[PDB]
Amino acid sequence: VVEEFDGYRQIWRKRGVMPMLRALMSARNIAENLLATAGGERRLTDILHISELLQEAGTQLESEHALVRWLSQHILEPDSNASSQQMRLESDKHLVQI
Amino acid sequence: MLRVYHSNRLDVLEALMEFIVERERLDDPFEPEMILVQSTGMAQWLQMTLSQKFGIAANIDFPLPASFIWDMFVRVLPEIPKESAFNKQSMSWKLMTLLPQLLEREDFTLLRHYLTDDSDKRKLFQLSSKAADLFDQYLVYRPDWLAQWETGHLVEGLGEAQAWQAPLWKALVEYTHQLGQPRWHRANLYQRFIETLESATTCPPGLPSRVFICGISALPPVYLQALQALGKHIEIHLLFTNPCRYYWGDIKDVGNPLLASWGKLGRDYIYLLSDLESSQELDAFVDVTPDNLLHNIQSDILELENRAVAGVNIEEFSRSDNKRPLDPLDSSITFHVCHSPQREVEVLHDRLLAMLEEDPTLTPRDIIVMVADIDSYSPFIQAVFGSAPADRYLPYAISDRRARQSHPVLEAFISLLSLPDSRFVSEDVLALLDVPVLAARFDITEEGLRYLRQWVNESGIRWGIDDDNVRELELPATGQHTWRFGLTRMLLGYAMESAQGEWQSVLPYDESSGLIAELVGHLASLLMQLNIWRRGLAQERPLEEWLPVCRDMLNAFFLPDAETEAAMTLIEQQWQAIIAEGLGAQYGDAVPLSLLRDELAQRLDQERISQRFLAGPVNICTLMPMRSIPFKVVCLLGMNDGVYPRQLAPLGFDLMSQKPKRGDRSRRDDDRYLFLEALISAQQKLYISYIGRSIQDNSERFPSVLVQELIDYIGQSHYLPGDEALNCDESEARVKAHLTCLHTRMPFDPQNYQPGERQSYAREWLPAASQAGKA
Amino acid sequence: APLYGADDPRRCSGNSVSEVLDKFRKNYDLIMSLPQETKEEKEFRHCIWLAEKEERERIYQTAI
Amino acid sequence: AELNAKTLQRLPGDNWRVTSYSGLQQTPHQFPRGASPGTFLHSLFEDLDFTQPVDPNWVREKLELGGFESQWEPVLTEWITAVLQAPLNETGVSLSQLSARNKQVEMEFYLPISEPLIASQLDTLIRQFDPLSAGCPPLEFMQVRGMLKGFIDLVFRHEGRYYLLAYKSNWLGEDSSAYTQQAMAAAMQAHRYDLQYQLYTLALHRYLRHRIADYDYEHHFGGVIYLFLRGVDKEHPQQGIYTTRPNAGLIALMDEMFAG
Amino acid sequence: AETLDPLRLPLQGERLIEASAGTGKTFTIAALYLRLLLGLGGSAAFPRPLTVEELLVVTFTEAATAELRGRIRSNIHELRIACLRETTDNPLYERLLEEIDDKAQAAQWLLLAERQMDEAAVFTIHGFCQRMLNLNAFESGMLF
Ligand SMILES: Nc1ncnc2c1ncn2[C@@H]1O[C@H](COP(=O)(O)OP(=O)(O)NP(=O)(O)O)[C@@H](O)[C@H]1O
Ligand SMILES: [Mg+2]
């Protein structure tokens, strides 16, 4: 596990943010298990949205630690008014619209 | 003689240039070849092609039309300065001085109401900049107006704002005569330059043998007149990419709707070219065989014929045989509807992989991807093209992205310039300490920052560097929760244990007690500096006094390194250039720091890096005018209604937009013509994508009007096999629905993995789509 | 390609790029030596080409 | 239903690329050194007029731009003259003797490489025709097909014979003996400037063959001149300058290799 | 209070149109937009025909603004097709064609409108204020 995380760190340094998370989800089969688990679809959608936001925030931030610092800061004070931070639709299927 | 070369494609013009260069050789070897281009990518492509053909391309100058015409001014007429006195940069600072002296005038009464409430000359500077831009545009496109304004008369039948614009320009000229600067500017110089060569018995010395104008499809009428006057002595070869074979400028609406709508930029240009008296033109076109949908549309555009059927007659509206058969397997033109830009790029990657697999001859360099705004799609493009596996890896290079060489140093310096206005929040100062250069300057290690975070937090530092800063904001002096308070507290805690008690109504901070407290001594060294400068930058200073400010601040606050030296040099160069323009304009009055800071902020990010346009990998870049290069695969992203075309409305008091003439340029028409250039340049495949439904709200978006007209023309000009019995409208809707592809919202949707042409290439989401995982 | 002006060495219209390049290459000196065309002649040639295109379109529409 | 993703039969190729010599490779003595000082020293000659004596005010303004000490201004001017008046290869050309018509500064060239350029298949020829390459270990780089870029410092013609001049501001040593012929050759071998000037000569030969009607290599070419700014001293004519002429056979075989 | 007929509604000065829910208030906007573009109604018509860029529409929400822009685009397209074909399957377009004098010039104007629909002046109150401040910063006295 330490070795795979060290390789993930190398991928993170080289190819950016999204490649590391993608390789992690592929190797750990996170998406498959979440889709299998009841309700995990919303979880996977939120994870993907968080990954996209982390990529957008790491593009501007050159330091690797700065992205973690920014993520912790945003977790401390979530901005509800932000349109980007709005939660996306759960599924494209038929949903009761409240 | 001025020879105009017409060709539907660029490669023909380029080969003609090749043959002309090879046939007639330059006598002197060191004489540089002249090729006019308005874009760097066009020049780079020309160089790469000429080197590939001849064996090497060198000593080929690529100046802009304006700079070239100014160079010709310098050589043909004597007593002309190297650089024009009237430029966009200097007129701003000159009008900044001239406007306060003219507020007493009645004609400027409205301007008075504008300049009444300004405190730090913000409105004055912005108005001067806008007026300088307007005057430059007038110089370029409207010399008669300036010629009339200099004498003091008014132009009949013009805009209302002329009343306040005509005298100012006059008051400018006289002003630049008092300082002693050269009177000559291009507007008055045009007629004399034309007359000197018109009556010249022989060719003047120093002129180049021949000139080339390649890739420029838009020129002002005055430049064309100057080139016509210059064509007598020296030959000029204009390579003009013409989308239509026949005469399509002011046809004696154009015949083709897709050309009439998007051809406003080229109609005026071809009408000007036709109006040249001493021009000899030969047509070198290439016919296109209508074997594909894209080739069919290109042939319709080239032949200036209309293929869509309106259906006015009942017999015409009933049968669908009037349209052209469309092959179902054909995929030359394909429209794609996605949900998010991430999904859009992820689908574009798979489509590019499919196109590469389908055709062995295709190469990544041939493919090009153009987006409305490259900065909005840069993270998604980069992540999608980086996450691809090694066997699936596609090389990419992104062009026209904002030039960001060292962002933290730039932002730290910009924030340091705002010192007098800053409240010195603890988080803000820690953000300045984030930069490793500013910390190395005060030998603050990265491990020490973990300690200084909790120290600042627990000690109680909230805002304010000292009590004087608190009193300066007209707030009651408290004496606590300031940087001085926290520093004194930490020092007392290093000196005296907190168990003893208060000494000066300040509880010592026990945490900083050992050798680590030396960090405090370094931190207290920073703030003191932050104090000194925050007092030095308050007072307004003349321009010559602002010269050593930037260098002193950099060498005081920053300790350079191998990487940061470049950014520091760029900052110094921009600062020195701004102050040099100011001093050349002889601005006497004092200038506040808030003006130079906000000017440097605008000047630093205006840079762009397009050096990797044709590096070899697939090209990612925005749509830039005057850059038309043929490519096999041409993809277009971000075509949502409102994003493209990009709308930049005029200032509102410009006189050109009131009574427009032929040759006037507008960003709207520029984008409308770039969309046509993208269509014509596509040789094999055209890909167009746009966001249909918002991923967040599941709402409905719309595509650009251009894509709408394109799909309308397609649906009205073609019919699928087996739909002959159907009427025009049903067959049109069927074709439009067959070509428009609606992709899924999520990558793990199993529809993506069903066998077909829409089948994806990413196997990572295959087990998820198959629903084979365990809970 | 328009029928009018086919004999003129200036015109290089062809079916492929290579044919156009050869057509231009063979008659380069002839093109250069020819004097410049008058404005009236250029307008006349453009009008003739437009009329030819119009007549072609009319004949096609009659064929429908 | 059954789901299967597609596979790629043909792998896309990254062979096509555009690279430079850097990509393939991968008192004045006490003057500060670095990337920025070197670029400043080069920009000085970029806009310097050789046919006129140096002006103290211009040097002072350039030192203000660079940010160096004004104390260098009295000396640097003299040093610049030492560069302008220093003699050259046996023709005895002085830099001040070059007029604005017989000079070309910072010429950018593009050279196509059609077949993939292998280090092994080139190093053998370079070692065969150049002893400096024989002294060094074999070239090592990956296959490259595409374009080659480069910026030539100066090209000038004298007596109807052309030359190539390349400025170098590397601090070879602290003493003048470190700027001798053997030491300069050792530095060339260490920084692999041999391949650099070879490619420069290939580019120049192709450009002259293209431009000059009835061109001949032996007749019109004059050799290669590396100018070490700090090495230039009025006392010793040899220290600071280096002159080398590539073999015509090497140039011809290199041209044929790069063509096909 | 009088019943409303979109074709006979005079467009001069201020006019108030009040009705209950689901009565087609938003739907009449398209008919009035077409009338303004074509300049129909005789006495009740505007004195001169107008362009897309001169008609202002103010909506409450952004989504409704986009919906109205799309629907106006679609109505312009359908009316242009009807004018080209001189026949239509909708009663409103049928009455319009009955009111139109010359259909070729009307179709040309509708084509120009379709081509300028990208610049349609349909905004919200806050967006209208922002755009008027930006376009006229000189008169309003704000920054550029
Ligand atoms: N004259 C008409 N002919 C046909 N359908 C109509 C007509 N007027 C309105 N409709 C339809 O009526 C429905 C609602 O119309 P709408 O314009 O939203 O009314 P409304 O006054 O805006 N309701 P509200 O927005 O809640 O105040 C839509 O489906 C329209 O197509
Ligand atoms: Mg409504």
What is the DSSP track for B148-181? Answer: HHHHT---TT--TTHHHHHHHHHHHHHHHHHTT-
User: B442 and B536: one domain?
Assistant: yes
Return the closest-CA partner of residue B419 out of B252, B533, B588. B533
What DSSP line would sit under B517-565, residue for residue? GHHHHHHHHHHHHHHHHHHHTTS-B-HHHHHHHHHHHHHHH----TTHH
Instruction: Please give the angle made by the CA atoms of A44, A47 and A50, to the nearest 5 degrees.
Output: 155
- φ, ψ of residue A74 to 5 degrees: the values are -65, -35
Experimental structure resolution, Å: 3.8
Is E115 in contact with B261 (Cβ distance < 8 A)? yes
Q: Which amino acid is at B256?
A: N
Helix (H, G, I), strand (E, B) or coil at B185: coil
Q: How many domains does chain A have?
A: 1
Distance CA B339, CA B640 (A): 11
Does the CA dihedral B205-B206-B212-B216 come out positive or negative? negative
Chain breaks in chain C (C to N over 2.5 A) after: none
Q: Which amino acid is at B78?
A: P
Asked if B364 reaches chain D (Cβ–Cβ under 8 Å), the answer is: yes
- Is E19 labeled as ligand-binding? yes
Q: Whose CA is nearest to atom 5 of ligand 1?
A: E24
User: B116 and B255: one domain?
Assistant: no
Domain membership of residue A94 (yes or no) is: no
Distance CA D133, CA D128 (A): 8
Helix (H, G, I), strand (E, B) or coil at B691: strand
Residues of B in contact with C17 (CB under 8 A): 9, 11-12, 15, 286
Return the closest-CA partner of residue B618 out of B368, B245, B437. B368
Asked if A17 reaches chain B (Cβ–Cβ under 8 Å), the answer is: yes
Residue list, ligand 1 pocket, CB within 6 Å: E 21-27
Q: Whose CA is nearest to atom 12 of ligand 1?
A: E24
Q: Give the residue from chain A lying closest to B383, CA to CA.
A: A18
- Is E22 labeled as ligand-binding? yes
C-alpha A78, offset from chain centre: 16
The answer to whether the CB of B17 falls within 8 A of the CB of B5 is no
Which residue range is the domain that position B116 belongs to? 86-185
Buried-exposed string A39-62: b where 16+ CB fall within 10 A, e elsewhere: ebbeebbebbbebbbbbbbbbebe
Distance CA B768, CA A30 (A): 9
Per the structure block, which two tokens stand in for B332? 């030359």
> Which ligand has the minimum distance to the alpha carbon of residue E7?
1
Does the CA dihedral E97-E99-E101-E107 come out positive or negative? negative
User: B439 and B500: one domain?
Assistant: yes
Does the CA dihedral E63-E69-E75-E77 come out positive or negative? negative
User: B424 and B554: one domain?
Assistant: yes
Distance CA D104, CA D154 (A): 6
B vs D: CB pairs below 8 A: 115
What DSSP line would sit under A4-71, residue for residue? HHHHHHHHHHHH-SHHHHHHHHHHHTHHHHHHHSTTHHHHHHHHHHHHHHHHHHHHH--SHHHHHHHH
What residues form DSSP beta bridges with A70?
none
Helix (H, G, I), strand (E, B) or coil at D109: strand
The answer to whether the CB of D229 falls within 8 A of the CB of D43 is no
Of C1, C2, C21, the CB nearest to B15: C21
Distance CA B717, CA A17 (A): 47
What residues form DSSP beta bridges with D103?
D156
Half-sphere exposure of residue B102: CA atoms within 13 angstroms, side-chain side? 22
Residues in CB range of B273: below 8 A, 6 or more apart: B4, B224, B238, B240, B279, B281
Helix crossing, B407-417 with B564-584: angle to 10°?
50
H-type helices in B418-542, by residue range?
A: 426-434, 436-441, 446-459, 467-472, 483-495, 518-536
> Which ligand has the minimum distance to the alpha carbon of residue E64?
2
User: B138 and B223: one domain?
Assistant: no
What residues form DSSP beta bridges with B19?
none
Distance CA E57, CA B515 (A): 70
Farthest CA pair distance, chain D:
89
Distance CA B252, CA B3 (A): 24
Distance CA C42, CA B251 (A): 15
Other beta carbons within 10 angstroms of residue B477's beta carbon come to: 10
Does the CA dihedral B589-B594-B595-B601 come out positive or negative? positive
Distance CA B97, CA B586 (A): 9
Domain membership of residue B329 (yes or no) is: yes
User: B737 and B631: one domain?
Assistant: yes
Distance CA A52, CA A44 (A): 12
C-alpha D105, offset from chain centre: 12
Residues in CB range of B468: below 8 A, 6 or more apart: none
Distance CA A19, CA A12 (A): 7
The answer to whether the CB of B717 falls within 8 A of the CB of B324 is yes
Per the structure block, which two tokens stand in for B566? 């470049």
Distance CA B620, CA B693 (A): 24
Distance CA B42, CA B624 (A): 11
Buried-exposed string B98-118: b where 16+ CB fall within 10 A, e elsewhere: bbeebeeeeebeebeebbeee
Residues of B in contact with D165 (CB under 8 A): none
Per the structure block, which two tokens stand in for D159? 């007596």
User: B369 and B510: one domain?
Assistant: no
H-type helices in B64-161, by residue range?
A: 65-76, 88-102, 109-114, 122-141, 143-151
Pocket test of ligand 1: the residue of E27, E32, E59, E60 to mutate, having most ligand atoms within 8 Å of its CB, is E27
What residues form DSSP beta bridges with D16?
D145
Return the closest-CA partner of residue B195 out of B85, B77, B275, B82. B77
The answer to whether the CB of B249 falls within 8 A of the CB of B274 is yes
Beta pairing class for B279-283 and B682-691: unpaired
Of B117, B122, B649, the CB nearest to E135: B649
C-alpha A47, offset from chain centre: 4
Q: Do chains A and C touch (3 or more CB pairs under 8 A)?
A: no
Domain membership of residue A95 (yes or no) is: no
Distance CA B480, CA B489 (A): 10
Residues in CB range of B590: below 8 A, 6 or more apart: B540, B541, B542
Ligand 1, residue E19: give the atom nearest the CA: 21
What residues form DSSP beta bridges with E124?
E59
Secondary structure of chain E as H, E, C letters:
CCCCCCCCCCCCCCCCCCCCCCCCHHHHHHHHHHHHHHCCCHHHCCCCCCCHHHCCEEECCHHHHHHHHHHHHHHHHHHHHHHHHCCCCCHHHHHHHHHCCCHHHHHHHHHHHHHHHHHCCEEEHHHHHHHHHHHCHHHHCCCC
Domain membership of residue A58 (yes or no) is: yes
Torsion of CA B739, B744, B750, B752, to 10 degrees: 40
Domain membership of residue B414 (yes or no) is: yes
Is B614 in contact with D18 (Cβ distance < 8 A)? yes
Domain membership of residue B775 (yes or no) is: no
Q: Give the residue from chain E lying closest to B648, CA to CA.
A: E135
Distance CA B335, CA B706 (A): 13
Distance CA C20, CA C12 (A): 5
Domain membership of residue A15 (yes or no) is: yes
Per the structure block, which two tokens stand in for E57? 């529409």
CA-based nearest distance B775→chain D, Å: 20
Neighbours of D, requiring at least 3 CB pairs below 8 Å, are: B
Domain membership of residue B542 (yes or no) is: yes
Is B386 in contact with A31 (Cβ distance < 8 A)? no
Is B282 in contact with C37 (Cβ distance < 8 A)? no
- Is E42 labeled as ligand-binding? no
Is A35 in contact with B748 (Cβ distance < 8 A)? yes
User: Which of B285, B313, B331 delimits the end of a domain?
Assistant: B285
Distance CA B448, CA B456 (A): 12
Residues of B in contact with D17 (CB under 8 A): 615-616
Helix (H, G, I), strand (E, B) or coil at B213: strand
Residues of B in contact with A83 (CB under 8 A): 696
Other beta carbons within 10 angstroms of residue E30's beta carbon come to: 19
Buried-exposed string B513-539: b where 16+ CB fall within 10 A, e elsewhere: beeebebbebbbebbeebbebbeebee
Q: Which amino acid is at B360?
A: P
Return residues 42-101 of B near D (CB < 8 Å). 47-48, 50-52, 54-59
Domain membership of residue A17 (yes or no) is: yes
The answer to whether the CB of B51 falls within 8 A of the CB of D111 is yes
Helix (H, G, I), strand (E, B) or coil at B569: helix
User: B467 and B605: one domain?
Assistant: yes
**Bond prior to B645 in cis (omega within 30° of 0):** yes
Per the structure block, which two tokens stand in for C53? 């295109």
Distance CA B768, CA B749 (A): 8
Of B407, B748, B773, the CB nearest to A29: B773
Helix (H, G, I), strand (E, B) or coil at B647: coil
The CA-atom distances, in angstroms, between B610 and each of B58, B59, B365, B614, E38 are: 20, 21, 15, 9, 47
C-alpha B86, offset from chain centre: 24
Buried-exposed string B210-234: b where 16+ CB fall within 10 A, e elsewhere: bbbbbbbbbbbebbbbbbbbbbeeb
Domain membership of residue A66 (yes or no) is: yes
The CA-atom distances, in angstroms, between B520 and each of B151, B466, B494, B496, B707 are: 69, 16, 10, 15, 63
Domain membership of residue B656 (yes or no) is: yes
The answer to whether the CB of D110 falls within 8 A of the CB of B614 is no
User: B210 and B348: one domain?
Assistant: no
Residue B75 DSSP class:
H
Helix (H, G, I), strand (E, B) or coil at B282: strand
Tokens 């491990």 found at = B447
Q: Which amino acid is at E92?
A: L
Distance CA B730, CA D131 (A): 79
Distance CA B35, CA B697 (A): 52
Return the closest-CA partner of residue B33 out of B65, B58, B4. B58
What DSSP line would sit under B573-584, residue for residue? HHHHHHHHHHHH
User: B168 and B122: one domain?
Assistant: yes
Per the structure block, which two tokens stand in for E12? 């001069």
User: B529 and B605: one domain?
Assistant: yes
Instruction: Please give the angle made by the CA atoms of B494, B495 and B497, to the nearest 5 degrees.
Output: 80
User: B354 and B384: one domain?
Assistant: yes
Residues of B in contact with C20 (CB under 8 A): 12, 284-286
What DSSP line would sit under D2-61, residue for residue? -------SS-----EEEE-HHHHH--GGGS--SHHHHHHHHHHHHT--TTSPPPHHHHHH
- φ, ψ of residue D90 to 5 degrees: the values are -45, -25
The CA-atom distances, in angstroms, between D216 and each of B28, B56, B425 are: 16, 17, 73
The CA-atom distances, in angstroms, between D190 and each of D20, D121, D187 are: 19, 21, 5
User: Which of B249, B268, B285 delimits the end of a domain?
Assistant: B285
Other beta carbons within 10 angstroms of residue A82's beta carbon come to: 10
- φ, ψ of residue B3 to 5 degrees: the values are -105, 125
Secondary structure of B243-259 as H, E, C letters:
CCCCCCCCCCCCCCHHH
Residues in CB range of B731: below 8 A, 6 or more apart: B320, B323, B719, B720, B723
Return residues 106-165 of D near B (CB < 8 Å). 107-112, 146-147, 155, 157, 162
Distance CA E103, CA E109 (A): 10
The answer to whether the CB of B368 falls within 8 A of the CB of B379 is no
Helix crossing, B40-54 with B10-23: angle to 10°?
50
Of A17, A31, A56, the CB nearest to B768: A31
The answer to whether the CB of B143 falls within 8 A of the CB of B187 is yes
The answer to whether the CB of B121 falls within 8 A of the CB of B129 is no
The answer to whether the CB of B659 falls within 8 A of the CB of B142 is no
Domain membership of residue A98 (yes or no) is: no
What residues form DSSP beta bridges with B369?
B620, B635
Distance CA D112, CA B239 (A): 24
Distance CA C52, CA B246 (A): 10
* Cα-to-centroid distance, E23 and ligand 1 (Å): 5
User: Which of B185, B203, B226 delimits the end of a domain?
Assistant: B185
The answer to whether the CB of A55 falls within 8 A of the CB of A18 is yes
Is B616 in contact with D146 (Cβ distance < 8 A)? yes
Asked if C64 reaches chain B (Cβ–Cβ under 8 Å), the answer is: yes
Other beta carbons within 10 angstroms of residue D20's beta carbon come to: 14
Distance CA B350, CA B467 (A): 62
Q: How many domains does chain B have?
A: 4
Distance CA B757, CA B532 (A): 69
Other beta carbons within 10 angstroms of residue D85's beta carbon come to: 14
The answer to whether the CB of E54 falls within 8 A of the CB of E118 is no
The answer to whether the CB of B239 falls within 8 A of the CB of B215 is yes
Other beta carbons within 10 angstroms of residue C50's beta carbon come to: 18
What residues form DSSP beta bridges with D157?
D162
Buried-exposed string B308-329: b where 16+ CB fall within 10 A, e elsewhere: bbebeeeebbebbebbeebeee
Beta pairing class for B235-241 and B631-637: unpaired
Torsion of CA D64, D65, D67, D70, to 10 degrees: -20
Q: Is B407 exposed, middle or buried (0-12, 13-18, 19+ CB in 10 A)?
A: middle
Distance CA E30, CA E87 (A): 19
